[PDB]
């Protein structure tokens, strides 16, 4: 149970994921590009968030097109991606645009805490 701000860090975050034990995820990223002939969106960390290295990753959302809003395919759009990572590929179950005002220093730090400080 984690919110990913750095898409390319997913495999490092869940080295044990697999089809037998997938990992539920939530990605907040910026769409850099969309490859129409392959129904693939290229995403990356939302810019101003961190200085940590990051690399674009390509998610095939072919099985989401019909239900998806077109806006989520426009490069520049900030999005939320709910998906299951099986250790090799990403299986998206939902995706929608999110407002840029949400990415403040305060909320980013809030996300860090909620990813480690829970359980007395």
């Amino acid at each position: 149970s984690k919110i990913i701000l750095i898409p390319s860090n997913i495999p490092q975050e869940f080295p044990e994921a697999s089809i037998s034990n997938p990992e539920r995820l939530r990605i907040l990223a910026q769409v850099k590009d969309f490859i129409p002939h392959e129904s693939t969106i290229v995403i990356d960390k939302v810019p101003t968030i961190t200085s940590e290295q990051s690399t674009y990753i390509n998610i095939c959302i072919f099985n989401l097109l019909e239900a998806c809003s077109s806006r989520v395919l426009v490069p520049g759009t900030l999005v939320n991606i709910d998906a299951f990572y099986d250790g090799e590929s990403i299986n998206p179950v939902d995706i929608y645009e999110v407002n840029g005002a949400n990415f403040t220093m305060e909320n980013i730090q809030l996300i860090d805490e909620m990813n480690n400080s829970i359980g007395k």
């Binding site: 149970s1 939320n80 939902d94 999110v98 909320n107 829970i118």
Partner: protein
């Protein structure tokens, strides 16, 4: 100097139920003294689900604590949670001229392990908040207040119980998919509250 209330809870460590190398679980008689009791506090679903099986701390006393959960060592009576609707089920039991319809949802605030909890509400409360009976409310963010029932297992004392929130009040924070700002608002509130009131264990000291 101002008046200092006093009540005798008996001799010695009588008011203390279980001593822990970290905190003390006090007897039920003291629950009303907790700054947490009888007040609707905003919690993280995870903190509720990670709540300990009370039979392993209060024995036969737990028979009367099904409606209570200890967050850290604070007894919670009234609960306030928020999250996305991840599951919908409509039920229509039949009685004497009485058709009572209800809704059962699973809400997820999503942070920590086991951040999902079953919630029960009447159809009236569901519809009056704008939720439709068409199974199309997935994703919506809600805020709920209510009483919780825990099926604490007296025999398997350490086992976590199945739980359910009886909703006394529901508010739809966002009918739209993008309610990210509402989640940051809710998450923040519950984090701040958890820091200032729950992280440091409750310590009860006489006058």
């Amino acid at each position: 100097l101002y008046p200092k209330t006093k009540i005798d809870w008996g001799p010695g460590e009588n008011h203390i139920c279980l001593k822990t190398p970290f905190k003390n679980f006090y007897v039920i008689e003291l629950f009303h003294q907790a700054p947490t009791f009888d007040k609707t506090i905003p919690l993280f679903i995870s903190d509720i689900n990670n709540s300990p099986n009370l039979y392993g701390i209060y024995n036969y006393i737990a028979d009367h604590l099904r409606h209570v959960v200890l967050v850290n060592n604070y007894p919670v009576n009234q609960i306030n949670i928020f999250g996305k609707i991840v599951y919908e089920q409509y039920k229509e039991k039949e009685f004497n001229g009485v058709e009572e319809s209800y809704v059962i949802l699973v809400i997820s605030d999503f942070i920590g392990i086991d951040s999902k909890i079953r919630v029960r509400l009447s159809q009236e409360q569901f519809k009056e908040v704008g939720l439709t009976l068409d199974k199309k409310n997935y994703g919506k963010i809600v805020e709920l207040e209510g009483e919780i029932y825990n099926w604490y297992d007296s025999i398997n004392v350490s086992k976590k119980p199945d739980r359910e929130l009886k909703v006394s009040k529901i508010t739809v924070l966002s009918h739209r998919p993008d309610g990210l700002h509402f989640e940051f608002e809710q998450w923040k509130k519950r984090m701040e509250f958890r820091k200032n009131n729950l992280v440091e264990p409750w310590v009860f000291i006489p006058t």
